[PDB]
């Protein structure tokens, strides 16, 4: 059975600075893998290095890129040409087609028109083989890049051969910094230069220089293909030859079979059945995306273990490494789709970050490759801890804890969004103020808060002094320190405790995080009950969220001074201020199960999986962000949500298939039947799990993990009775205490 054909990795790169469609480009890699592979139609720095309405091709890229904002490291670049050997990025461009395009996870191949020339590329993890199929030529070539910055290149024409490093990066990498790559060709170089500052030093073999470059070239029959085999390392040439030893000595045809194996083997974890042809695209697109990030960033010694550079301190170090990934973004459902249907590989991804830990003194939050300033939070501690209540569990949880400890009193003095900034305020106050030069200091109080909870339950779990569980508790309740009565939504607060004026709840940034009030007050994830009590209960927090589908889009944009395209994708949805592609409002559509009206939930879930996905170039609504957003529809489509990841509670929406199967590491399967789903039946009348009545709005991950089946009997009328009982809601932590 194959899945692989329903992925698009076009989906998201039909974007732009003003209005992103996902800002993704076609990652041909394996999944988590060290190095991915673009065709690169972008100029060599920018952000945008794949775009679909572009004309032009100007290179093969190796990229860890994880996002346009972030940028690039460990980047170099192979192109073919004919005619004259030009290494200029521009000069050497071919104008290409989509019609001409074949893009996979495993297998890219492109026609290059203005060389007549066809590329395939097919990766493993670390290495990736080219093949070449050139015209009848004399004067035939290949170009290496090791971009600008500070970079090395040889050639070494006795073994058919390029080896480089290449250092450009965007920050967040050690001093020593640098990726080693070897390039190995089935087909003697007749002509072999190296470039240095643009010119061309033909039979020179070396350059070290600030844009080192090599053209070699040779003499082609009609159709003649040449093969390149390339990998690269962060640790050495030696290591990068061993990488190399991923292709074995496999060509094309069975690189992309044994990459095709690879993709079936994860994506097939997650059968659906009975949708249409778009949905299904849009399932396996979205869940291809859930599989990339964070990389791995380690690599195989000669014994077969782990060993990797680190990002952090600049040393080769035994363990596991990953990196490129945000928490702020992550933390929502991403890497609770790791815990449910991927846990082995979260396990080796917790281990890296305790690895991180030792490295550089703090878990991260960004991380690109080392810490990078992005972003806020402290949600580390919730990927942690939900790791750990799911039976993810390092093995030194001693440093697990410390960790954690650490972080709750201490920022990194050069990267303000790794570690706590304004931790003082906030652990002496309860909240970081609006007044004291802290930007977006109610996004992290709401933040803070949640993850204080997150610590609350390991603590709790690991029976520590009840002083320590109590403290954890009492700072669990923070997010109550920002909640204003008067406008029942969460406003910035100043250090002499009066609420900021004037307040303004449309206003994006400033107090908050890429998003306004409308959109942070329900960052309570762990409290939902409590939320609802500080409204006045759940008829007027329903009312509250009622209005934000309702109301226009206004906003105010002076924090900014532009509208930036999160407001842009805001206003042009239709949906009032329910601003999907917004990380902090994308768990809200489930709340209207803690107030005991499901069938509210049901209504809007399948209008934003109706509206705010489909399969093309312009995919999704906003930035897909390394797998939340998309991992959100994998979930959604499912009938599913982890609102509060530390919980063992994934809060009930409505499932988009007729069936879905899920098959789970431990060997046990889990079908989900809803036979009478479709596009006018997405309420749910009624659910069973296993024969039993269930009329609960969640299911527990224990329960999901023994297997069987649930029945979703769906309608086209709400079930105003269903799920309404106290006993029906999820978790809430003023409920526990
Ligand atoms: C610097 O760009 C960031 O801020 C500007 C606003 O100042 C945003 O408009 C822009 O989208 C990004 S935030 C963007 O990138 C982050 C890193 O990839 C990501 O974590 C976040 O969710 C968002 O997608």
């Given at each position: 059975?194959?899945?692989?054909?329903?992925?698009?990795?076009?989906?998201?790169?039909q974007?732009?600075?003003?209005?992103?469609?996902?800002?993704?480009?076609?990652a041909?890699?394996?999944?988590?893998?060290?190095?991915?592979?673009?065709?690169?139609?972008?100029?060599?720095?920018?952000?945008?290095?794949?775009?679909?309405?572009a004309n032009?091709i100007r290179?093969?890229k190796?990229?860890?890129?994880?996002?346009?904002?972030?940028?690039?490291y460990?980047?170099?670049?192979?192109?073919?040409?004919?005619?004259?050997?030009?290494?200029d990025?521009?000069?050497?461009?071919?104008?290409?087609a989509?019609?001409?395009?074949?893009?996979?996870?495993?297998?890219?191949?492109?026609?290059?028109?203005?060389?007549?020339?066809?590329?395939?590329?097919?990766?493993?993890?670390?290495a990736?083989?080219?093949?070449?199929?050139?015209?009848?030529?004399?004067?035939?070539?290949?170009?290496?890049?090791?971009?600008?910055?500070?970079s090395y290149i040889?050639?070494?024409?006795?073994?058919?051969?390029?080896?480089?490093?290449?250092?450009?990066?965007?920050?967040?990498?050690?001093?020593?910094?640098?990726?080693?790559?070897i390039?190995?060709?089935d087909?003697?170089?007749?002509?072999?230069?190296?470039?240095?500052?643009?010119?061309?030093?033909?039979?020179?073999?070396?350059?070290?220089?600030?844009?080192?470059?090599?053209?070699?070239?040779?003499?082609?029959?009609?159709?003649?293909?040449?093969?390149?085999?390339?990998?690269?390392?962060?640790?050495?040439?030696?290591?990068?030859?061993?990488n190399?030893?991923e292709?074995?000595?496999?060509?094309?045809?069975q690189?992309?079979?044994?990459?095709?194996?690879?993709?079936?083997?994860?994506?097939?974890?997650?059968?659906?059945?009975?949708?249409?042809?778009?949905?299904?695209?849009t399932?396996?697109?979205?869940?291809?995306?859930?599989?990339?990030?964070?990389?791995?960033?380690?690599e195989?010694?000669?014994?077969?273990?782990?060993?990797?550079?680190?990002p952090?301190?600049?040393?080769?170090?035994?363990?596991y490494?990953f990196?490129?990934?945000?928490?702020?973004?992550?933390?929502?459902?991403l890497?609770?789709?790791?815990?449910?249907?991927?846990?082995?590989?979260?396990?080796?991804?917790?281990?890296?970050?305790?690895?991180?830990?030792?490295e550089?003194?703090?878990?991260?939050?960004?991380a690109?490759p080392?810490?990078?300033?992005?972003?806020?939070?402290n949600?580390?501690?919730?990927?942690l801890?939900?790791?750990?209540?799911?039976?993810?569990?390092?093995?030194?949880?001693?440093?697990l804890?410390?960790?954690?400890?650490?972080?709750?009193?201490?920022?990194?003095?050069?990267?303000?969004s790794?570690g706590?900034?304004?931790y003082?305020?906030?652990?002496?106050?309860?909240?970081?103020?609006?007044?004291?030069?802290?930007?977006?200091?109610?996004?992290r109080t709401?933040?803070?808060?949640?993850?204080?909870?997150?610590?609350?339950?390991?603590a709790?779990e690991?029976?520590?002094?009840?002083?320590e569980?109590?403290?954890?508790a009492?700072?669990?309740?923070?997010?109550k320190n920002?909640?204003?009565?008067?406008?029942?939504?969460?406003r910035?607060?100043?250090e002499?405790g009066?609420?900021?004026?004037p307040?303004?709840?449309?206003?994006?940034?400033?107090?908050?995080?890429?998003?306004?009030?409308?959109?942070?007050?329900?960052?309570v994830?762990?409290?939902?009950?409590?939320?609802?009590?500080?409204?006045?209960?759940?008829?007027?927090?329903?009312?509250?969220?009622?209005?934000?589908?309702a109301?226009p889009?206004?906003?105010?944009?002076?924090?900014?001074?532009?509208?930036?395209?999160?407001?842009?994708?805001?206003?042009?949805?239709?949906?009032?201020?329910?601003?999907h592609?917004?990380?902090?409002?994308?768990?809200?559509?489930?709340?209207?199960?803690?107030?005991?009206?499901?069938?509210?939930?049901?209504?809007?879930?399948?209008?934003?999986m109706?509206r705010?996905?489909?399969?093309?170039?312009?995919?999704?609504?906003?930035?897909?962000?390394?797998?939340?957003?998309?991992?959100?529809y994998?979930?959604?489509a499912?009938?599913?949500?982890?609102?509060?990841?530390?919980?063992?509670?994934?809060?009930?929406?409505?499932?988009?298939?007729?069936?879905?199967?899920?098959?789970?590491?431990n060997?046990?399967?889990?079908?989900?039947?809803?036979?009478?789903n479709?596009?006018?039946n997405?309420?749910?009348?009624?659910?069973?799990?296993?024969?039993?009545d269930?009329?609960?709005?969640?299911?527990?991950?224990?329960?999901?993990?023994?297997?069987?089946?649930?029945?979703?009997?769906?309608?086209?009328?709400?079930?105003?009775?269903?799920?309404?009982?106290?006993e029906d809601?999820?978790?809430?932590?003023?409920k526990?205490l």
């Amino acid at each position: 059975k194959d899945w692989t054909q329903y992925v698009n990795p076009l989906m998201g790169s039909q974007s732009t600075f003003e209005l992103s469609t996902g800002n993704t480009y076609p990652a041909i890699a394996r999944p988590w893998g060290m190095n991915f592979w673009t065709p690169q139609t972008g100029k060599m720095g920018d952000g945008w290095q794949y775009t679909y309405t572009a004309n032009k091709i100007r290179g093969f890229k190796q990229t860890h890129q994880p996002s346009p904002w972030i940028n690039d490291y460990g980047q170099f670049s192979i192109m073919p040409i004919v005619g004259q050997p030009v290494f200029d990025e521009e000069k050497r461009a071919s104008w290409f087609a989509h019609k001409g395009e074949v893009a996979t996870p495993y297998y890219y191949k492109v026609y290059l028109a203005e060389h007549d020339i066809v590329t395939e590329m097919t990766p493993t993890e670390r290495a990736v083989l080219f093949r070449f199929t050139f015209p009848e030529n004399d004067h035939s070539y290949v170009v290496v890049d090791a971009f600008d910055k500070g970079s090395y290149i040889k050639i070494i024409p006795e073994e058919n051969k390029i080896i480089g490093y290449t250092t450009r990066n965007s920050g967040g990498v050690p001093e020593n910094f640098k990726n080693y790559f070897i390039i190995e060709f089935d087909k003697p170089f007749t002509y072999k230069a190296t470039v240095e500052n643009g010119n061309l030093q033909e039979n020179v073999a070396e350059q070290t220089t600030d844009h080192a470059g090599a053209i070699i070239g040779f003499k082609t029959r009609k159709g003649e293909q040449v093969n390149a085999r390339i990998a690269s390392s962060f640790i050495s040439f030696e290591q990068a030859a061993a990488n190399m030893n991923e292709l074995g000595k496999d060509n094309i045809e069975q690189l992309a079979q044994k990459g095709k194996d690879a993709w079936n083997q994860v994506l097939g974890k997650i059968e659906v059945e009975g949708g249409n042809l778009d949905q299904y695209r849009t399932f396996y697109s979205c869940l291809y995306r859930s599989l990339l990030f964070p990389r791995k960033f380690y690599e195989l010694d000669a014994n077969g273990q782990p060993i990797h550079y680190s990002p952090y301190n600049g040393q080769v170090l035994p363990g596991y490494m990953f990196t490129d990934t945000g928490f702020w973004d992550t933390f929502r459902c991403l890497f609770p789709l790791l815990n449910l249907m991927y846990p082995s590989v979260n396990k080796e991804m917790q281990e890296g970050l305790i690895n991180t830990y030792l490295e550089s003194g703090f878990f991260p939050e960004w991380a690109s490759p080392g810490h990078r300033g992005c972003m806020v939070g402290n949600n580390s501690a919730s990927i942690l801890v939900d790791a750990y209540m799911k039976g993810v569990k390092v093995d030194d949880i001693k440093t697990l804890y410390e960790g954690l400890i650490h972080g709750t009193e201490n920022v990194h003095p050069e990267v303000s969004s790794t570690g706590r900034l304004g931790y003082e305020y906030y652990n002496k106050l309860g909240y970081v103020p609006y007044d004291v030069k802290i930007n977006e200091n109610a996004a992290r109080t709401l933040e803070y808060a949640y993850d204080d909870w997150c610590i609350y339950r390991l603590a709790k779990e690991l029976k520590r002094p009840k002083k320590e569980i109590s403290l954890f508790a009492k700072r669990a309740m923070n997010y109550k320190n920002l909640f204003d009565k008067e406008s029942k939504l969460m406003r910035g607060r100043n250090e002499d405790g009066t609420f900021q004026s004037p307040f303004s709840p449309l206003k994006w940034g400033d107090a908050f995080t890429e998003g306004n009030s409308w959109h942070y007050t329900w960052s309570v994830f762990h409290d939902p009950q409590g939320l609802i009590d500080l409204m006045g209960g759940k008829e007027m927090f329903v009312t509250m969220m009622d209005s934000v589908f309702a109301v226009p889009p206004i906003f105010d944009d002076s924090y900014y001074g532009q509208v930036i395209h999160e407001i842009r994708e805001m206003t042009v949805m239709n949906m009032g201020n329910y601003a999907h592609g917004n990380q902090p409002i994308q768990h809200m559509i489930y709340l209207y199960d803690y107030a005991g009206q499901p069938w509210k939930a049901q209504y809007w879930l399948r209008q934003v999986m109706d509206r705010m996905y489909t399969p093309g170039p312009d995919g999704y609504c906003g930035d897909e962000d390394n797998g939340q957003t998309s991992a959100w529809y994998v979930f959604s489509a499912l009938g599913f949500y982890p609102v509060c990841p530390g919980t063992d509670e994934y809060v009930m929406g409505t499932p988009l298939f007729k069936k879905a199967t899920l098959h789970f590491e431990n060997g046990n399967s889990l079908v989900i039947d809803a036979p009478n789903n479709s596009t006018e039946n997405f309420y749910i009348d009624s659910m069973s799990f296993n024969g039993a009545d269930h009329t609960k709005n969640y299911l527990r991950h224990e329960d999901l993990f023994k297997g069987g089946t649930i029945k979703v009997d769906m309608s086209n009328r709400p079930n105003l009775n269903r799920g309404t009982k106290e006993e029906d809601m999820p978790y809430s932590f003023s409920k526990e205490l």
